Amino acid sequence: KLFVPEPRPVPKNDVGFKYSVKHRPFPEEVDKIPFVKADLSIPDLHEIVTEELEERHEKLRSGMAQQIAYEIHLEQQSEEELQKRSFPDPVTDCKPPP
Amino acid sequence: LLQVFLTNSANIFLLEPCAEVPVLLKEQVDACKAVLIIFRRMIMELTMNKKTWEQMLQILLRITEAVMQKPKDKQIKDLFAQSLAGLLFRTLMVAWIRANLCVYISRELWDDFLGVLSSLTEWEELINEWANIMDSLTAVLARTVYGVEMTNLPLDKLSEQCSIIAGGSLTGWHPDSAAVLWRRVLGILGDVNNIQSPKIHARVFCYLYELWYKLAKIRDNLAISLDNQSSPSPPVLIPPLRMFASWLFKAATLPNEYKEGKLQAYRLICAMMTRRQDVLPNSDFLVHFYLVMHLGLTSEDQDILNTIIRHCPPRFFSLGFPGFSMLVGDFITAAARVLSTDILTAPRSEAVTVLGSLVCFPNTYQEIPLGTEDVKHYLINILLKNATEEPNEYARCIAVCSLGVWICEELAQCTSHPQVKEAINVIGVT
Amino acid sequence: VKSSLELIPLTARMVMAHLVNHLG
Amino acid sequence: LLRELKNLDSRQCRETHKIAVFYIAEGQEDKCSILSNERGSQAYEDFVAGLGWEVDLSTHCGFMGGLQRNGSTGQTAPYYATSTVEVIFHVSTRMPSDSDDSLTKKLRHLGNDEVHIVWSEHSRDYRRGIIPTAFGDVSIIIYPMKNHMFFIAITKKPEVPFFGPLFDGAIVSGKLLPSLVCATCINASRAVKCL
Incomplete structure (x- = not known):
């Protein structure tokens, strides 16, 4: 008779372990020690910007904010499209030739 | 005593x-x-x-x-x-x-x-x-x-x-x-x-x-x-892992007398930001990283471009850092500049790999500020030029494979782009 | 860039036979 | 003459390829849990569904590639064949692994293949040597990304020359993933055989 392929198995999304912990480079007992003048050798990011790059810094910040909004919108539309589609995706489901 | x-x-x-x-x-x-x-x-x-x-x-x-x-x-x-x-x-x-x-x-x-x-x-x-x-x-x-x-x-x-x-x-x-x-x-x-x-x-x-x-x-x-x-x-x-970046970002803006230090800092920061990140970086750190990368890519010394491209695989794109769209255009321009030069010591393989990695972004990332049609035209022109001019066999092979992937993407999305026929002709002559 | 039967007859015969048999 | 005729009829008449497909869930970095998976993500199932139709092993008259009729090695498997090329996938999420002997059989079946499609949603990069095997000269690895995009990384032995239409570090969308992956695997198998 005709060749009818077997149905695909149903998948389950919740597979595998999930972890949500807090990472600290040093134990909390270290934080109790007061800082000395040697601990300030590495400058903070606040002081790393000079007067010649302030306008550039502001322009990059605004551009990055715009890009974040754009990427959030694209993520929303992509997840909506994904939830619209069904499991047996016709555009990429391989089937025997007639 | x-x-x-x-x-x-x-x-x-x-x-x-x-x-x-x-x-x-x-x-x-x-x-x-x-x-x-x-x-x-x-x-x-x-x-x-x-x-x-x-x-x-x-x-x-x-x-x-x-x-x-x-x-x-x-x-x-x-x-x-x-x-x-x-x-x-x-x-x-x-x-x-x-x-x-x-x-x-x-x-x-x-x-x-x-x-x-x-x-x-x-x-x-x-x-x-x-x-x-x-x-x-x-x-x-x-x-x-x-x-x-x-x-x-x-x-x-x-x-x-x-x-x-x-x-x-x-x-x-x-x-x-x-x-x-x-x-x-x-x-x-x-x-x-x-x-x-x-x-x-x-x-x-x-x-x-x-x-x-x-x-x-x-x-x-x-x-x-x-x-x-x-x-x-x-x-x-x-x-x-990312603790010295404060030194690197300031070392990146030093004058030309510290060129070797700038090259080393670029290599270090590029190798630092190209791996998996356990914790998501803060917004200010991302702003500083984007600014320093933008300054580095649009520089004039060819050594800067060679160092920043030779050590930056598309894994950086794969990481999915927030707001990295401008880097797409900056990397396209950098790849074009590095491949225009005919110095045999340039990272041709890495350049063509980076160039071909971005081949699917413009189609899926419609209406990106950094036009979509203009960016696609520029990228396909660069690809066509590379497929017929690369003197290294590895780079040429990667370029041909990338051109084939681009043709497949254009056919799949049904763009009806007129440049498809030229790519087919390029493949046929090869 | 910087750079035992003959295979071609056997391949030609196989291609001709395959086209005659399985085409359509 | 009878023995020689039987031997001649035993030989195949097309191009046969054998491919192993794995699956990695978040937080899995050991052989036991990686080989004990019985189901995958929706994207993984869709991707595997795009590599060919399903064939019932009980009444399949085509290529086997070491699989068995009794159902010990699984009941269904993806299948993609053409006028001259036939490919069967040893998907690791279809073979039951409810016992230690089943694990040994699955390992000895998957370890004899020369091409691995190591899907990986893990938060850490895939490492060579997690799944021991003498073969495995080509190991295509897929890392899912945002906006339905995908990342493809290829690790090959030094002896194997450039083979595939997918360069290392290529980024492809979801639509092109099955066709490109299948073609790359076929070309890799051809290169390994020609080696």
Whole structure:
């Protein structure tokens, strides 16, 4: 008779372990020690910007904010499209030739 | 007795300089060498209280500040100063480490040590000794705070197959003491970018890259199942991979006299940001990284482009860092610029791999500020030019494969782009 | 860039046979 | 003459290829849990569904590639064949692994293949040596990304020359992933055989 392929198995999304912990480079007992003048050798990011790059810094910040909004919108539309589609995706489901 | 001995013997280093190298300078050097040898002998096989430690540290600091405070001579190259400093730096650093791990040290002494070391950052031997002591401290930290041996590692095997300084009363290597000691010794030189000599800057940044590589190896080696039967949960303590970035970002804006340092900083930051990130970086850090990358890619020196492209695989795109769209256009322009040049040492393979990696972004990322049709036209023009001009077989093969992938994408999305026929013609002639 | 039967007859015969047999 | 005729009839008449497909879930870094998976993500199932139709092993008259009729090695498997090329996938999420002997059989079946499609949603990069095997000269690795995009990384032995239409570090969308992956695997198998 005709060749009818077997149905695909149903998948389950919740597979595998999930972890949500807090990472600290040093134990909390270290934080109790007061800082000395040697601990300030590495400058903070606040002081790393000079007067010649302030306008550039502001322009990059605004551009990055715009890009974040754009990427959030694209993520929303992509997840909506994904939830619209069904499991047996016709555009990429391989089937025997007639 | 030993206190008054060291106080009285400190005068031998403060001896007047001699104008006769063969005999007077040789005798003074030998005497100072003997004194520093007995100092090193007594610093390890003897016990002492905090007053003796403070006196010894003060004597060493005064000797170092006095004997090395003659930079006004340029045509005179007497071996006296360097010959003493080569051992004096090591002795001072070892004594400081031992004193810190043995007894409490006041913060004023720490500040004096930091100042006297920062004011004398123009000597290369000091840099070498700092590098060696930092290597030893990092090995100790890896052995202690993370429970990982540097000599043998699970990855290495697979390849083969309260503290007194913290306010307590415990003496020895402990997670509290080792961490603060390593953090404090890291910034002894002060802000590195204040260093004047470009060679010293390059040496320091090369060692910094080596240090980051060791830290990354330690981080990767962590959380590995030796029995290959159960995956352990990731530990709550991880090495701080992205800690030196504050130095790198400032080193990236230095003038052209520090070109080698800028290249090393670019390599380090690019290798740092191209791996998996355990914790999402903050917004300000991302802004700084994007700004420095944008400045680097749109530079004029070809060495800058070669360094920033040769070490930046599309894994950076794969990481999905927020707001990285502008980097798409910047990387396209950088790849075009590097492939226009015909120097055979340029990273052609990496350039074409990066160029072909972005081949699907414009279609899925419609209406990106960095037009979509204009960007696609520019990218396809560059691809067509590369497919018929690359002198390296590997680059040409990658270009042809990327062109085929682009053709497949255009057909799948049904763009009806007129450039498809030209790509088909290019394939046919090949 | 910088840079035992003959296979072609056997391949030609196989291609001709395959086209004659399985085409359509 | 009878023996020689039987031997001649035993030989295949098309191009046969054998491919192993794995699956990695978040937080899995050991052989036991990686080989004990019985189901995958929706994207993984869709991707495997795009590599060919399903064939019942009980009454399949085509290529086998070491599989068995009794159902011990699984009941269904993807199948893609053409006028001259036939490919069968040893998907690791279809073979039951409810016992230690089943694990040994699955390992000895998957370890004899020369091409691995190591899907990986893990938060850490895939490492060579997690799944021991003498073969495995080509190991295509897929890392899912945002906006339905995908990342493809290829690790090959030094002896194997450039083979595939997918360069290392290529980024492809979801629509092109099955066709490109299948073609790359076929070309890799051809290169390994020609080696």
